[PDB]
Design a protein around this ligand. Structure first.
Ligand SMILES: Nc1nc2c(ncn2[C@@H]2O[C@H](COP(=O)(O)OP(=O)(O)O)[C@@H](O)[C@H]2O)c(=O)[nH]1
Ligand SMILES: [Mg+2]
Length: 384
């Protein structure tokens, strides 16, 4: 019944991300809309090893009167870099926690930057520890700096909701703290939009295999949107884009009239040659996506223990980039002042592939070396 939304607390270590998370569950639990999770339950988040990468993440759920939320909170900076780049925890919005006494700190800056690189749509701020600041004019100045920092990374710093409170007071049952928590959740309900359904997006299916029996059939999972018998589709990319019509959709022993987000199907293509279709291309609504060879991306480089490299790479490093279904070789260019990239670092890079790929901001990929994963990335900018 209630719409679902995924959010999380970001911010510098020790500014109160975990205390605020606990306070949210406590106050909403007091309204009969969540189970209360204490500070220690959340601070001691379990390790989850997906694909060699190990990440500590606390998962709580709670509801307002309008929505149902899934909430992620992580102990260490490194955990946020990982989750945000790999996508192990998506965020329809983020709650930025900033200590009112200390103000923005390096990881406050980095999480805003990451939030923009990976496409976190919108941010709300909880300006925490107001009980340690006794001067109103000091409070306004720190709020002012936060809005500038947000705007310096293209978020609407002038329009973002910033709620001032004390998560620890709220957790002690203080009435003024609890009101701050509800001001925060009222802003989350109002300012963070509900995510677009996958089935409502323009059709896109990555091609995993190609067959010629009836004619040419391609198999894969429909990533988003719907494809119906009789509709036109474009084939992107690697080669010049081309257009055809869907004449059939099917599973095991089951013909279909349509294929929609989440379905594993085979799609009949009319008059398309098998040699003109190959793994790595995608089917898509005509005009909805384009092929590109060059782009910028935010990447996380796996550590030795995570199965990655154990030596840095330098400008001109030439690995394979795994987009959806296959590798494509590309050359890496490093930022202006960056000289090397150590295992475990995150950095923004420019890449030029040797072949085009259907590409768009927010597309995730792996970096591979010798058939081994060495990095994970997110396309942050297209370069034509
Ligand atoms: N005085 C005060 N201390 C707080 C507040 N919120 C959190 N703290 C303290 O700040 C320290 C770190 O808080 P924590 O939530 O673990 O920060 P995190 O690293 O972002 O998760 C703890 O000792 C908390 O008790 C607050 O509103 N006021
Ligand atoms: Mg914490």
């Amino acid at each position: 019944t209630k719409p679902h939304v995924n959010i999380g607390t970001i911010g510098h270590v020790d500014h109160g991300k975990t205390t605020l998370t606990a306070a949210i569950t406590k106050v909403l639990a007091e309204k009969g809309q969540a189970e209360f999770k204490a500070y220690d339950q959340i601070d001691k988040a379990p390790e989850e090893k997906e694909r060699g990468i190990t990440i500590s993440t606390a998962h709580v759920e709670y509801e307002t009167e309008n929505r149902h939320y899934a909430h992620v909170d992580c102990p260490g900076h490194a955990d946020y870099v990982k989750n945000m780049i790999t996508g192990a925890a998506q965020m329809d919005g983020a709650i930025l926690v900033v200590s009112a006494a200390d103000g923005p700190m390096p990881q406050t800056r980095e999480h805003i930057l990451l939030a923009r690189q990976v496409g976190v749509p919108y941010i709300v701020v909880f300006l925490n520890k107001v009980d340690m600041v006794d001067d109103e004019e000091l409070l306004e100045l720190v709020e002012m700096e936060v809005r500038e920092l947000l705007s310096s990374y293209d978020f609407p710093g002038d329009d973002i909701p910033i709620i001032k409170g004390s998560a620890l007071k709220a957790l002690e049952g203080d009435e003024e703290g609890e009101e701050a928590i509800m001001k925060l959740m009222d802003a989350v309900d109002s300012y963070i939009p509900e995510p677009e359904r996958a089935i409502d997006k323009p059709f896109l299916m990555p091609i995993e295999d190609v067959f010629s029996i009836r004619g040419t059939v391609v198999t894969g999972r429909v990533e988003r949107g719907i494809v119906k018998v009789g509709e036109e589709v474009e084939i992107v990319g690697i080669r010049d884009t081309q257009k055809t019509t869907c004449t059939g959709v099917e599973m095991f022993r089951k013909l279909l009239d349509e294929g929609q987000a989440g379905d594993n199907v085979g799609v009949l293509l009319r008059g398309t040659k098998r040699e003109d279709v190959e793994r790595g291309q995608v089917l898509a609504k005509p005009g909805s996506i384009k092929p590109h060879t060059k782009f910028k991306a935010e990447v996380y480089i796996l550590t030795k223990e995570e199965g990655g490299r154990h030596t840095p790479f330098f400008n001109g490093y030439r690995p394979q980039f795994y987009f959806r279904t296959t590798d494509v070789t590309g050359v890496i260019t490093l930022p202006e002042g960056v000289e090397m990239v150590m295992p475990g670092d995150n950095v923004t890079i420019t890449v030029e592939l040797i072949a085009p790929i259907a590409m768009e901001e927010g597309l995730r990929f792996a970096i591979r070396e010798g058939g081994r994963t060495v990095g994970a990335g997110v396309v942050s900018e297209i370069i034509e």
